[PDB]
Amino acid sequence: GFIMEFAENLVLRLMENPEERDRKAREHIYEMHERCKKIKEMWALPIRPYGFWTFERHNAQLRWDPQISQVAGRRDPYDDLLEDN
Amino acid sequence: GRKKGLPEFEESAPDGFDPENPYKDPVAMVEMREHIVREKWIQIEKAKILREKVKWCYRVEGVNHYQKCRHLVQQYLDSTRGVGWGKDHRPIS
């Protein structure tokens, strides 16, 4: 053929779907705003959590001392006296 | 892909938009803005069409142009009263 009859549909192939572009734009806005709200919530967390000491890793002694309160140097004076019988 | 033609757009006004709280819904903001600008351009082109009509009037009208085109003059001016983004007269659409 001639030049323009091919350059026309060439440019038309080069250009994209606008419906896809609009859908992607509204989508991206939706999830970006949702993620923005999520990050805003995340930044509100205090440095020290409400539980803190309640956490099992932050006790480390309520389940260690009971198995140590029997060794010498930690016993209540009234433990060795009546342990004989 | 392309429709290789005029860019068809939805004439229907977008839903979920409230004038009292526009900023509440962000996803509906951009299409309402696009619709408003498109309608403004429709008004602009209507004014341009009236200007073209009076353009072609003045040549055929001759000396006594006032007599038989006065009706179209008011039609063109009322369109120019609510024009787009112009002088201090801002239309309330």
From Swiss-Prot, chain B:
Compartments annotated for it: namely: Mitochondrion inner membrane
What InterPro entries does the record point to? NADH_UbQ_OxRdtase_su10, NDUFB10
Keyword Electron transport carried by entry: yes
- According to its UniProt record, where is this protein mainly located? mitochondrion
Region Disordered, as annotated, extends over 1-24
Query: What domain of life does the native source organism fall in?
Result: Eukaryota
Q: How does it sit in the membrane?
A: Peripheral membrane protein
Q: Which UniProt keywords apply?
A: Electron transport, Membrane, Mitochondrion, Mitochondrion inner membrane, Respiratory chain, Transport
A Gene Ontology BP annotation from the UniProt entry: photorespiration
Q: Which Pfam families match?
A: NDUFB10 (PF10249)
This entry carries the following GO cellular component terms, namely: cytosol; mitochondrial inner membrane; mitochondrial membrane; mitochondrion; respiratory chain complex I
Keyword Disulfide bond applies: no
| Function according to Swiss-Prot or TrEMBL | Accessory subunit of the mitochondrial membrane respiratory chain NADH dehydrogenase (Complex I), that is believed not to be involved in catalysis. Complex I functions in the transfer of electrons from NADH to the respiratory chain. The immediate electron acceptor for the enzyme is believed to be ubiquinone.
| Subunit annotation | Complex I is composed of at least 49 different subunits.
Name the family.
Belongs to the complex I NDUFB10 subunit family.
Protein name per UniProt: NADH dehydrogenase [ubiquinone] 1 beta subcomplex subunit 10-B
User: Which species does this protein come from?
Assistant: Arabidopsis thaliana (Mouse-ear cress)
